[PDB]
Design an enzyme around this catalytic site. Structure first.
Site, PDB file in Angstrom:
ATOM      1  CB  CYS A   1     -46.617  37.077  64.341  1.00 39.73           C
ATOM      2  SG  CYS A   1     -47.155  35.352  64.312  1.00 39.73           S
TER       3      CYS A   1
ATOM      4  CB  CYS B   1     -43.228  35.187  65.029  1.00 40.48           C
ATOM      5  SG  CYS B   1     -43.922  34.833  63.403  1.00 40.48           S
TER       6      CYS B   1
END
Ligand code: CL
Ligand code: K
Length: 118
Positions: free
Chosen positions: A38, A41
């Protein structure tokens, strides 16, 4: 300190020990529930570690990779999106912020959450 590294949570038993330590100190903790694929993230990590340094000795910050940790630990957070940054206190999740957008902006929303419970 300018940046503090987030400590990984190994499993549900480790979360239990973390929460017992936080209760001893009457402090909340922060958990960053994230995934390594991600981009949101990944880009948030250094900004969270800068924020963790601002709360050194006051709030411990942790991370949990939702694909690597056991499924039972992910269920403790009731995670459905990443990054999900949760504030825990008194053995339970008190509030959360869902990332999804610019890391600096997620950090300001996490700061507002911290100020309510610290
Ligand atoms: Cl577990
Ligand atoms: K959820």
């Amino acid at each position: 300190p300018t940046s503090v590294e987030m400590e990984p949570i190994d499993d549900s038993h480790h979360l239990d020990k973390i929460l017992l330590q936080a209760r001893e100190l009457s402090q909340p903790i922060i958990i960053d529930w994230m995934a390594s694929w991600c981009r949101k993230c990944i880009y948030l990590k250094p900004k969270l570690e800068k924020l963790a340094a601002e709360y050194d000795t006051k709030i411990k910050f942790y991370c949990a990779d939702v694909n690597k940790v056991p499924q039972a630990l992910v269920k403790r957070g009731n995670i459905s999106k990443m990054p999900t940054i949760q504030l825990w206190k008194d053995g339970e999740m008190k509030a959360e912020v869902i990332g999804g957008h610019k890391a600096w902006l997620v950090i300001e929303e996490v700061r507002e959450m911290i100020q309510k419970f610290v």
